[PDB]
């Protein structure tokens, strides 16, 4: 929110040169001056025979606003033979990737082409030039003896580059190995020490590189983007790369160990063609000193209110935990076709609040599709989901979209103001813009009234114009402000004071200042840096007795303060900004003395009472929880009476009861400011005598623990009176209860087997599954629906194995689904066969007993029993033509719950599954 959009730094290269396609800061240790690095591919150079080789320009903050091209190659194409070029270098897009660490600058040409020195070819290998001081070396790791598309020839290395904490480059290239992509990492010293200008392919010691994979990974485009961070305890920056076309164009992000190049973690997009991994960035947004992952998907399509797909883009925010796998949240875009996730730029701590911040850019959104950059502040809980500022493109369309925000670089403080600044590239208009962060001031203002209660018969002060004694009070307004970084010593504040803010426009003022004789006053204050809260005074005379007829209603003293711009740094137009979330105005209230008794002081007696209409609250689900509050004041009036509901962490307070006349509404608002959640309800200002008020507040508890027995609510009333200002704190608890609705269901597949079996004969020793009979399938499902879960349960299956010594339903196999084990008292499939009513009562029984694990709401446990009808036992002699109903029963018993030390009860039921065989 502190970025200055009034007077940024405009940089413009030549037109058509994509000036601004890549940006970075340059902070050499050689000097105190800092420079801007702006890549500009498609830029015509002095290189002989080279058309649009591309440049990298050095722009200075010296305010001359001038850029100078950096000499990297300055030479044309080397030759493999006479009239046979070795390199081509025309339209090589040099400067498409520019990154600098300290005194070293790395720039790359991903469209650089090679002759391969074996056959005559033009292969987009890509090359880079690493410059340190006067010396310049060429780094082209993808240029090697591995040539064709199955090699590194189309790799286009230098497509994305990054440094690490200690002298190591991370270079990606999408075209390696039939466009599987590749990451190559080399020590900076190795690149400089091993350079041989007469050697076109240089072998670097300690080179970390990914290797070719199976052809199913073709066209993944690994190395499309790169970022660095530490995602394990080693301490060295590791490798993060987006793979936008990976996994059937879902998009992937790979994290490789920065030491031995092994894979560490993975990310995958949820939507195809969204280009998940187009942009990647690594920063610590929550201050827990663990690097967090940012992944852009500019073409992601969410659903609008109508439900139709719309392309707004989205960014994946993954917070790293010290234990393991991340916590990932999604941030959707705003405008359609804006490509919200195109560029993700970390920028230091922008507001110097202690938590790092970040900027996400939508280059084609905004007014006239000029481009928008969104600034997101970090917090203790992670990234704030809401932008704190937006940057709008100031440049028109011309041939191609301005693409403002297509490239960004932050995190570096180019002026001494003490706040990191930001570079935004456009390249559509061939421009680059620098936004300087403004300093942040945190200001707190106190207001007090001497005294808070006014007596009209107590007239003391004399009016200036004429001599009359008037009831008066004092108002003191104190002001203190400070901030980090560079900012002036003394600050100019303009403060306004308003008396009786309630009654205004057409109304009675009821209060005015002594000297100015006015309801309002203005003051010019000047304070200095930290501490030293200054104060001033003008005093508040009260109007004539019975000049209003309006007693009771408090006189609200209102102070608001602004900042006259004036003071600023030598930065020529950088003025500070007030803190983002902080009140610019503070109010106090004086009350006229009314019905305070003979002591002339109002001492109330406040009382809170709550009965229990709600008794049981069930664990595992939200549910209506309504408390009826009875707040009564027996005694003299209570100034600014408020009901304070101190809630637990599980509260989730909503609304109030409207539907009853017995309890008449209320004014309640949820708020949490200092270390505590609570609900505040206004009981009237003043809350007069009598005043027995009934009301209700609705809550939905998402509970906690599963070791919790109760939930705690504490209630009391507070007021501004000097004596007996509060009420005794009353506590009401409703107990957690366990209710789990568990059902057992079954089905026979099929429920019918018609006799005789078509094309069936009798084998006396069969192992077929065809000679036994048809497949009868019983499926039993134990499902827990009720809100509470259970930890352990037992399941007993009774199965009709035999009737009169011969088989009824021969079980081949049984399978489980969910947290359950099962055991058969008799060996299942003992013959090793491979692919009226008959229950387990009055028939030979085969028992299957099962132990059930934890079953929550949405989950169940299933037992699949595949059996064969034994045709030989039917159809033969004692069973020839009769109707038999095969019956199997299954019962369940819930034996335990995770909610131990809470009431339990028990759950038990049973269902039976029947298979009827018939003749006719």
């Amino acid at each position: 929110f502190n970025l200055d959009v009034d007077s940024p730094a405009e940089y413009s290269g030549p037109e058509g040169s994509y000036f601004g396609f890549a940006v970075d800061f340059f902070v050499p240790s050689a000097s105190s001056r800092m420079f801007l690095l702006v890549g500009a591919p498609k830029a015509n150079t002095t290189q002989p025979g080279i058309v649009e080789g591309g440049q990298v320009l050095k722009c200075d903050w010296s305010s001359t606003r001038r850029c100078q091209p950096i000499e990297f190659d300055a030479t044309g194409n080397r030759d493999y033979a006479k009239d046979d070029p070795l390199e081509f270098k025309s339209h090589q897009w040099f400067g498409a990737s520019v990154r600098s660490k300290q005194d070293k600058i790395l720039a790359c040409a991903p469209l650089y082409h090679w002759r391969t020195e074996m056959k005559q070819e033009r292969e987009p290998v890509g090359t880079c030039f690493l410059q340190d001081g006067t010396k310049t070396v060429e780094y082209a790791p993808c240029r090697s003896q591995d040539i064709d598309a199955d090699g590194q020839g189309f790799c286009q290395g230098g497509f994305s580059i990054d440094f690490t904490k200690a002298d190591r480059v991370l270079l990606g290239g999408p075209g390696s190995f039939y466009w599987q992509g590749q990451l190559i990492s080399d020590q900076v010293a190795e690149i400089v020490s091993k350079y041989d200008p007469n050697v076109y392919s240089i072998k670097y010691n300690n080179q970390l590189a990914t290797r070719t994979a199976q052809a199913i990974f073709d066209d993944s485009y690994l190395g499309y983007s790169v970022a660095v961070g530490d995602f394990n305890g080693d301490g060295i920056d590791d490798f993060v790369s987006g793979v936008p076309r990976a996994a059937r164009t879902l998009g992937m992000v790979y994290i490789y160990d920065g030491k031995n190049m092994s894979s560490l973690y993975n990310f995958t997009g949820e939507q195809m063609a969204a280009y998940f991994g187009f942009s990647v960035a690594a920063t610590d947004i929550n201050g827990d000193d663990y690097a967090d992952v940012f992944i852009g998907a500019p073409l992601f399509m969410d659903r609008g209110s109508d439900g139709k797909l719309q392309e707004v883009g989205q960014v994946s925010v993954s917070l790293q935990r010290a234990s393991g796998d991340f916590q990932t949240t999604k941030l959707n875009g705003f405008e359609v076709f804006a490509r919200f996730g195109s560029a993700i730029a970390p920028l230091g701590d922008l507001d110097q609040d202690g938590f790092n911040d970040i900027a996400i850019a939508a280059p084609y959104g905004g007014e006239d599709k000029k481009g928008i950059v969104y600034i997101f502040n970090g917090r203790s809980t992670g990234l704030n989901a809401v932008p704190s500022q937006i940057l709008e493109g100031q440049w028109a369309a011309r041939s191609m979209p301005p693409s403002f925000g297509y490239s960004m670089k932050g995190a570096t403080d180019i002026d001494k103001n003490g706040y990191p600044d930001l570079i935004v590239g456009a390249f559509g208009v061939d421009r680059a813009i620098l936004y300087r962060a403004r300093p942040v001031i945190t200001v707190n203002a106190g207001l007090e009234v001497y005294p808070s209660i006014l007596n009209q018969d107590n007239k003391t002060c004399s009016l200036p114009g004429t001599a009359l004694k008037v009831s008066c009070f004092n108002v003191r307004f104190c002001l203190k402000a400070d901030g980090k970084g560079v900012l002036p010593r003394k600050l100019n504040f303009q403060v306004e004071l308003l008396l009786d803010k309630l009654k205004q426009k057409g109304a009675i003022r009821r209060a005015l200042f002594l000297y100015s004789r006015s309801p309002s006053h203005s003051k010019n204050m000047t304070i200095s840096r930290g501490g030293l809260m200054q104060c001033e005074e003008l005093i508040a005379y009260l109007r004539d007795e019975s000049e209003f007829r309006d007693k009771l209603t408090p006189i609200t003293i209102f102070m608001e303060y602004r900042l006259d711009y004036r003071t600023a740094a030598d930065t020529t137009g950088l003025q500070p900004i007030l803190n983002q979330f902080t009140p610019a105005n503070i109010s106090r209230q004086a009350h006229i003395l009314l019905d305070c008794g003979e002591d002339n002081v109002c001492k109330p007696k406040l009382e809170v009472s709550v009965d229990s209409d709600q008794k049981k609250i069930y664990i595992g689900d939200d549910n209506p929880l309504t408390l009826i509050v009875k707040a009564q004041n027996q005694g003299e009036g209570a100034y600014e009476a408020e009901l304070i509901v101190s809630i637990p962490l599980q509260a989730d307070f909503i609304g109030v009861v409207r539907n009853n006349e017995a309890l008449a509404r209320l004014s309640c608002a949820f708020k949490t400011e200092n270390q505590t959640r609570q609900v505040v309800c206004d009981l009237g200002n003043p809350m007069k005598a009598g005043t027995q008020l009934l009301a209700g507040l609705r809550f939905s508890v998402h509970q906690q623990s599963e070791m919790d027995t109760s939930v705690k609510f504490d209630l009391q009333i507070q007021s501004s009176n000097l004596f007996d200002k509060v009420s005794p704190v009353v506590s009401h608890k409703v107990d957690l209860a366990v209710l789990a609705a568990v059902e057992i269901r079954g089905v026979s597949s099929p429920d019918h087997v018609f006799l005789p079996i078509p094309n069936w004969e009798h084998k006396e020793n069969p192992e077929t599954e065809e000679d036994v009979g048809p497949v009868v399938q019983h499926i039993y499902e134990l499902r827990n629906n009720g809100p509470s879960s259970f930890s352990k349960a037992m399941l007993h299956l009774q199965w009709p194995y035999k009737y009169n010594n011969n088989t009824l339903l021969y079980i081949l196999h049984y399978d489980i689904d969910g947290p359950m084990n099962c055991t058969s008292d008799m060996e299942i499939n003992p013959l090793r066969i491979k692919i009226h009513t008959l229950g387990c009562g009055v028939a030979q029984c085969l028992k299957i007993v099962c132990q059930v694990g934890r079953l929550d709401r949405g989950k169940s446990a299933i037992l699949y029993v595949k059996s064969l009808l034994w045709t030989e036992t039917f159809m033969n002699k004692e069973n020839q033509n009769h109707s038999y109903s095969l019956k199997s029963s299954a019962s369940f018993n819930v034996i335990e719950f995770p909610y131990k030390n809470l009431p339990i009860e028990d759950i038990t039921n049973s269902t039976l599954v029947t298979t009827n065989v018939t003749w006719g």
Binding site: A149, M272, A273, P401, G506, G655, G684
Partner: protein, 690 residues
């Protein structure tokens, strides 16, 4: 009676209408102060004041034109009109709603132009050969469904630039296939050869004049071709009265948007037509591949049905691409493209099997509800689409339009229309926020004498602090003890203590943290309820303690969606027919069923129990599912009475049941891949012998 317009009303003519759709105003030419004021019709009626003085605008659904749905859409007549009504005039008073209807029909013989968009990379050389006579073969097949047919051809390979193109050796540029020891022609981004014509011989002639090229990287961008063939309609010759089918044939993967960055292409695709007189896509080298969103938008605007004809290896990929582009169907393409002629006819059946309404240019101030009548008289609320239709069927939709407040927007207009259809329902919206008497001026003084003033519509709202019909008070002291009629239910505090009473009117004080309004100051903003801690969930406006929800939001807390898309299952039935859809979530009715779409029911009966209901009504013409006349809506399965029922069906189910004639019927259920499922019923069942 007391009601709402009577008390809590009475501010101004325009301010009284904004209260409720049922309210009215009066300019009675007299001054019986009393309480004629702002009130209901029936109340104000018995109070007299009716020399047209009552101003009670009623919301109108009037149709401006409704042509009858035609029977055959081929030739003669005029204005095929497969949608009706066409133009209606919607006129809405503040916070009101009215409802209308729309009927759409897939009409018999309807003109159909089909444009063939073919991959010409080398693995399609087998395909281009067998396509030679399939132009005239397609003529005879489409002749049965449509008398007026048009065909056209276009080709694509990929962007003719590195890394995709063969850039070297220079010996191989005109012949990108050189090491193959044969000859092909240089690759092209998108090549349009034959514009749509009614001569099918003209098709086969241009084919086999075409030949195959070669590319390097496996993904072949056809999205450049799909985008161009859609928006270049003048060049490729889409009829405007016809059903547009664009068949896309490729055996490999495809390039997607932002892939062109490797080739040095940073310019996003524009939906414009860059195919020139040379019939080539000029922007192919200079412009990136189009995104799925941009393709979806231009595909919808030009009413183009896109068909994906792809090989079995890559068919699952284009299925999922089609799932992100609604209205696009996919089909399995044989390696040699011998299957396209049948695949086209099957695709057209799917395209004309569905009806779904789309909305264009809808003002956000008003929202559209939907109920659907597809199968006989049964209504399906919340659904704007119908499924399982055959050509000639007609379906209905009931739509409700409701606003919040009312704009001065100059009334605009918007469009309701089924997808892929030329015909549409155009709705002209209009808003009357204010009475007719406001045009009569009367700037200030009049009955409220000197000290400025104002008179409007039979009442005077005068001055900063002057209040009454006679302007007086303004906190001069001037103390009326008003008591009665400044608060209802006499004995209660004045103006609810929010605000106060001065001069007899309540001018509400304590205006901060939101505004306090109302004549008794009983109303306000921010007084509404919360759902997760966010008031009205952020999905509705707060007006006097009640939430006015945004479009596609309903409920007291405005946290309930009207969206049925998250209730939609993979088979096309919302909640699988096993439950209702409430606030975007299914609630399963059938016992033992669960899941987001109620798709999981392990304890449900087997398909033998389910699909036997189809064989009853479809074959034996009896049982349930017949008397509902749904016998063929829910049963789309092909059924054939046969002998045998052999073994080799692989994935299949054998089923036996006894009908009401005490005979045993035996049938089978079988399907191929993600394709259709077929029921084989054994003819001559087994019955008790005589």
């Amino acid at each position: 009676g007391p009601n709402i317009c009577t008390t809590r009303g009475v501010s101004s003519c325009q301010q009284c209408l904004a209260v409720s759709p049922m309210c009215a105003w009066c300019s009675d030419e007299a001054l019986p102060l009393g309480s004629p004021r702002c009130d209901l019709k029936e109340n104000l009626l018995k109070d007299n004041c009716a020399p047209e003085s009552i101003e009670f605008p009623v919301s109108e659904a009037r149709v401006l034109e409704d042509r009858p749905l035609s029977d055959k859409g081929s030739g003669d007549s005029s204005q095929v009109t497969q949608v009706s009504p066409q133009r209606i005039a919607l006129r809405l008073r503040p916070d009101d709603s009215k409802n209308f209807s729309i009927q759409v029909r897939q009409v018999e013989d309807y003109p159909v132009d089909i444009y063939y968009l073919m991959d010409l990379s080398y693995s399609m050389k087998d395909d281009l050969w067998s396509i030679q006579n399939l132009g005239t073969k397609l003529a005879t097949q489409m002749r049965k469904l449509t008398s007026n047919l048009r065909i056209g051809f276009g080709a694509f390979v990929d962007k003719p630039v590195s890394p995709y193109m063969y850039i070297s050796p220079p010996e191989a540029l005109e012949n990108p296939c050189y090491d193959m020891k044969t000859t092909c022609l240089p690759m092209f981004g998108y090549k349009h050869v034959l514009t749509l014509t009614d001569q099918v011989t003209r098709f086969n002639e241009e084919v086999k004049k075409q030949s195959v090229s070669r590319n390097r990287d496996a993904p072949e961008g056809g999205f450049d071709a799909i985008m161009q063939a859609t928006v270049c309609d003048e060049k490729i010759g889409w009829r405007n009265d016809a059903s547009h089918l664009l068949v896309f044939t490729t055996d490999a993967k495809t390039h997607i948007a932002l892939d062109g960055r490797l080739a040095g292409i940073v310019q996003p695709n524009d939906g414009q037509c860059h195919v020139g007189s040379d019939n080539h896509y000029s922007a192919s080298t200079t412009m990136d591949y189009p995104s799925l969103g941009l393709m979806t938008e231009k595909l919808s605007q030009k009413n183009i049905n896109l068909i994906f004809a792809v090989t079995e290896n890559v068919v699952n990929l284009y299925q999922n691409y089609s799932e992100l582009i609604p209205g696009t169907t996919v089909g399995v393409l044989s390696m040699d493209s011998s299957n396209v002629l049948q695949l086209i006819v099957d695709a057209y059946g799917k395209i004309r099997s569905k009806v779904e309404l789309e909305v264009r240019d809808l003002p956000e101030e008003l929202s559209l509800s939907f109920n659907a009548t597809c199968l006989n008289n049964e209504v399906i609320p919340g659904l704007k689409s119908c499924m399982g239709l055959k050509i000639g069927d007609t379906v209905s939709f009931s739509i409700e339009a409701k606003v919040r407040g009312c704009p001065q927007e100059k009334e605009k207009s918007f469009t309701i229309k089924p997808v892929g259809f030329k015909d549409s329902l155009i709705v002209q919206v209009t808003f009357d926020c204010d009475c007719a008497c406001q045009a009569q001026a009367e700037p200030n003084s009049h009955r409220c004498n000197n000290g400025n003033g104002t008179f409007e519509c039979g009442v005077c709202r005068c001055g900063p602090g002057w209040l009454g019909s006679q302007c007086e008070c303004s906190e001069e002291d001037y103390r009326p003890s008003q008591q009665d009629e400044c608060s209802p239910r006499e004995g209660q505090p004045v103006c609810s203590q929010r605000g106060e009473c001065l001069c007899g009117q309540c001018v509400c004080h304590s205006s901060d943290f939101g505004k306090i309004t109302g004549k008794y100051c009983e109303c306000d903003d921010f007084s509404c309820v919360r759902y997760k801690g966010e008031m009205c969930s952020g999905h509705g406006q707060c007006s006097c303690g009640d939430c006015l929800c945004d479009s596609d939001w309903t409920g007291y807390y405005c946290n309930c969606t009207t969206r049925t898309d998250t209730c939609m299952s993979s088979n096309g039935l919302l909640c699988s027919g096993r439950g209702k859809c409430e606030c975007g979530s299914c609630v399963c009715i059938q016992p033992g069923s669960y899941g987001d779409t109620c798709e999981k029911c392990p304890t449900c009966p087997d398909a033998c129990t389910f699909k036997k209901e189809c064989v009853e009504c479809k074959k034996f013409d009896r049982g349930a599912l017949h008397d509902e006349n749904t016998c063929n809506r829910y049963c789309r399965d092909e059924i054939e009475s046969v002998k045998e029922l052999k073994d080799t069906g692989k994935d299949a189910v054998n089923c036996t049941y006894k009908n009401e004639d005490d005979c045993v019927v035996r049938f089978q259920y079988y399907e191929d891949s993600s394709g259709k499922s077929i029921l084989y019923v054994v003819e001559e069942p087994e019955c008790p012998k005589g």
